[PDB]
Amino acid sequence: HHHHMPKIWTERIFDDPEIYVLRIDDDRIRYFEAVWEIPEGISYNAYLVKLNGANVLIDGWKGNYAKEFIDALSKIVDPKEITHIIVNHTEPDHSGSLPATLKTIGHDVEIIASNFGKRLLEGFYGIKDVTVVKDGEEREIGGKKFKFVMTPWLHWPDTMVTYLDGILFSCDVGGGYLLPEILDDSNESVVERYLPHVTKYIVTVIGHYKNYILEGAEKLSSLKIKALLPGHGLIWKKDPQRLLNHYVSVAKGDPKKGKVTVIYDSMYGFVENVMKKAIDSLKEKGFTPVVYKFSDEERPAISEILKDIPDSEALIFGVSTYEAEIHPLMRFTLLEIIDKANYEKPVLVFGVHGWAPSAERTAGELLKETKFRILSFTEIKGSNMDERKIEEAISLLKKELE
């Protein structure tokens, strides 16, 4: 499958403070967290800060790349001269190289983490001597002031960001999928192509906690932010506020005019027939549908469905009945939308009237517990159906959005 080793970037990105990035481009991974389809890949970004009397490592790489990490680090510093390691987030996509790193340094170093971070490092790796920093705590290290800001539930309770002279090292906060062709936000075209992969990352990794994005953005707003250096994806040296505003806009679900996401299963073609008419009606009325169909020949990626929800003006679901409940892939999709992408947006539901036991929960009653506002339910029938009901539903949606 893979013809080459993962691409590694090692570059000085600031002169004062002297900061290096160590980035590896993981094109081996297929499913982030063993669930989210990312054919585009993801990078892991670690940093080294070379100071006067200290060398500070910030974060690390996934453990399957530990050997590559130590080789890359050794090119920019003798690992024996490392004095501090800052662990903003202990998840193994960032901390997996830490045991090998500690072994290669060969002497004690100060490891800095949050309170929960300390507990997790002990749990994962048996690392015991960890210095805990509290919210807003400052430490003078190598002649410079580091400040630690807790940003819990982005997306674990251990998560924090490290601030140095206007430079924020933010680990998952500000991350995205995709392996960008450059390191930073200097080129407009690269940024525009990258941002939808940031949306996909936010919803899939942080969506359940999208309220804590808003709390975190507010907390970070009080800091002077000159640059944002995340643990995945692009570095933002020019316009970090653009990334923060994007995060907030995704978390708030700010809609793109005209965008309607249509998600359905069609076991035999009856749902398809109705959805095709609904989609054509939407197009006639000036909307731009984004369509995800589960059929006997096609299966969308759940990560891609999730990506499209936040900026949708509305959603339309087309549902088959199956046994006592609904179609299994539709169940999975709805449960993940509820978990990751629970937004106050209008919805239409189209469904086959089956013969499921009345005890079975409908797609409709599952959706009724969410923030979504179901405008109407429309029955999908084989023969004898009133196609005027499809147009009525789409017209109702148009009037709602007007």
Examine residue 97 and tell whether it contacts a second copy (CB under 8 A).
no
Among 16, 108, 140, 296, binds a second copy (CB under 8 A): 296
Examine residue 384 and tell whether it contacts a second copy (CB under 8 A).
yes
Contact track, Cl ion, 263-282, x by CB under 5 A: ---xxx-xx-----------
Other CB atoms within a 10 A radius of the CB of residue 160 amount to 29
Examine residue 5 and tell whether it contacts a second copy (CB under 8 A).
no
Examine residue 96 and tell whether it contacts a second copy (CB under 8 A).
yes
Contact positions with a second copy (CB under 8 A) in 123-142: 123-126
Q: Are 26 and 43 a contacting pair, CB within 8 Å? A: yes
Q: What is the largest CA-CA distance in the chain?
A: 82
115 three-class SS? helix
Among 14, 23, 27, 32, binds a second copy (CB under 8 A): 32
Contacts 24+ apart (CB under 8 A), 325-330: 325/356, 325/360, 325/361, 326/362, 326/363, 327/265, 327/267, 327/294, 329/265, 329/294, 329/299, 330/264, 330/265, 330/294, 330/363
Examine residue 157 and tell whether it contacts a second copy (CB under 8 A).
yes
Which pair of tokens denotes residue 122?
A: 């002990």
- Given the rule CB under 8 A, which of 139-147, 234-242, 249-257, 377-385 is the region that contacts a second copy? 377-385
DSSP class of residue 235? B
- Report the C-alpha gap between 384 and 159 in whole angstroms: 57
* Closer of 295 and 376 to a second copy (Cβ): 295
Residue 35, binding choice from a second copy, Cl ion, none, Cβ under 5 to 8 Å by partner class: a second copy
Cα distances (Å, whole numbers) of residue 83 to 113, 142, 286, 400:
15, 10, 60, 60
Examine residue 339 and tell whether it contacts a second copy (CB under 8 A).
yes
Q: Are 312 and 372 a contacting pair, CB within 8 Å? A: no
Contact track, Cl ion, 314-353, x by CB under 5 A: ------------------x---------------------
* Closer of 213 and 243 to a second copy (Cβ): 213
Report the interface residues with Cl ion, using CB under 5 A.
266-268, 270-271, 332
